[PDB]
Design a protein around this ligand. Structure first.
Ligand code: MTY
Length: 405
């Protein structure tokens, strides 16, 4: 680690929270979602088209202003507080986030920009960006991914525009929160906003995958919406969630300066959708510069349905690695970072196969299985060996583990 961190021309005093690895710094600024012909970019464009064309189609729909080049550096106030996330909420753990320090971090979700954009008076906007999270390692997790956010506000008169005695209906009231609504909302209002959310997302999803796909709404919870849903798509026989969404917490919308609006919001994972839409097997492919992959996304128009042709799958080399955790100083995600650093994209997955306490010493023992498998070629036993030992050493030097091997 170190003393100061310097990012995009700015300086961050380091502290008890800071945990940014250099490997990750190097991805910042890369902006794949603004990269012409990259699948993430393509999805972004297609989503953008849907809203503009949905903005011409009907007098209802507003203009969504699009922000796809905001800096991923934000304050914990933006990323958490402004979205009502309690101080003790697990999503804040040092072990799950990349903190430049106590006050700044790499945003963990594009929702970190809602308050700012809404405070700026906006009513409908999209945000698209690289987000950052310390998580596990497998073909479906990567420390960096991309999200597309959408917020849409409604005025009273707009929401109830199409009815008889309309203006006698309201957005607000003071009842109690239930499973179906916030305390300061009318069920009349919540029902129409929720309908609008689902319909938009459904039309959109249907734009992207045609009238073929199986979706389902799932009731869930987020501190910044209520009610909230995850939308799942069935793919390869499994219900995968591809987005979060719901009716915006009114205190959020009020603290931004629009106490007269009711809104929905959603956040969708670009990679997660891309992998389903194009049958892309491993998240790592988004970052490889192999033409066998990238070329397949060069199309004349963003609607020219691409036919993703899987690359060959190469053989893996598997190596276990065990060791003793420092005396109460350790995070599983610490190790996964070290594996990202040393093994880079050579690593396909890391499983924590074994854990146990030694009676005599009270020390704890972790054993992990590392699957080395390169997306573009056969890995030689020799190269894996070297990498694996380097990992072994590094583990000891940096993580203060005792090489049990
Ligand atoms: N920010 C959440 C997804 C989400 C949920 C609800 C509303 C949003 O606008 C976005 C996440 O990253 O998981």
């Amino acid at each position: 680690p170190g003393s100061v961190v310097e990012l995009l021309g700015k300086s961050y005093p380091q502290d008890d929270h800071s945990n940014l690895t250099r490997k990750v710094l190097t991805r910042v600024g890369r902006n794949l979602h603004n990269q012409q012909h990259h699948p993430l970019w393509l999805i972004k464009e297609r989503v953008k088209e849907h809203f503009y064309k949905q903005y011409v189609g009907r007098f209802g729909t507003p203009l969504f202003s699009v922000y796809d080049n905001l800096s991923p550096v934000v304050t914990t106030w933006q990323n958490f507080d402004s979205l009502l996330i309690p101080a003790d909420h697990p999503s804040r753990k040092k072990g799950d986030n990349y903190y430049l320090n106590r006050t700044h971090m790499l945003r963990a979700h594009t929702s970190a920009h809602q308050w700012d954009l809404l405070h700026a008076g906006l009513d409908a906007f999209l945000v698209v960006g690289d987000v950052y999270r310390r998580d596990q390692i497998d073909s479906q997790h990567y420390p960096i991914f991309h999200q597309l956010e959408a917020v849409r506000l409604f005025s009273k008169h707009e929401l109830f525009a199409g009815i008889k005695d309309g203006e006698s209906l309201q957005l607000f009231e003071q009842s109690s929160r239930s499973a179906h609504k916030q305390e300061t909302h009318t069920m009349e209002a919540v029902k129409l906003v929720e309908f609008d959310l689902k319909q938009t997302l459904t039309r959109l999803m249907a734009h992207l995958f045609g009238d073929e796909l199986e979706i389902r709404w799932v009731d869930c919870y987020f501190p910044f919406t209520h009610p909230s849903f995850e939308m799942e798509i069935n793919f390869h026989g499994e219900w995968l969630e591809v987005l979060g969404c719901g009716v915006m917490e009114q205190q959020l919308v009020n603290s931004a300066g629009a106490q007269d609006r009711i809104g929905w919001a959603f956040g969708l994972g670009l990679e997660r959708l891309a992998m389903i839409l194009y049958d892309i097997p491993d998240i790592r492919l988004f970052w490889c510069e192999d033409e066998r992959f990238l070329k397949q996304f060069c199309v004349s128009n963003i609607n020219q349905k691409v036919k993703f042709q899987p690359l060959s799958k190469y053989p893996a080399v598997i190596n276990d690695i065990s060791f003793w955790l420092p005396s109460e100083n350790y995070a599983e995600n610490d190790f996964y970072d070290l594996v990202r650093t040393i093994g880079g994209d050579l690593v396909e997955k890391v499983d924590l196969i074994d854990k146990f306490v030694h009676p005599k010493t009270h020390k704890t023992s972790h054993c992990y299985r590392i699957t080395y498998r390169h997306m573009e070629r056969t890995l030689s036993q020799r190269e894996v060996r070297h990498i694996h030992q380097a990992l072994q050493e590094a583990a000891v030097q940096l993580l203060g583990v005792e090489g049990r091997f």
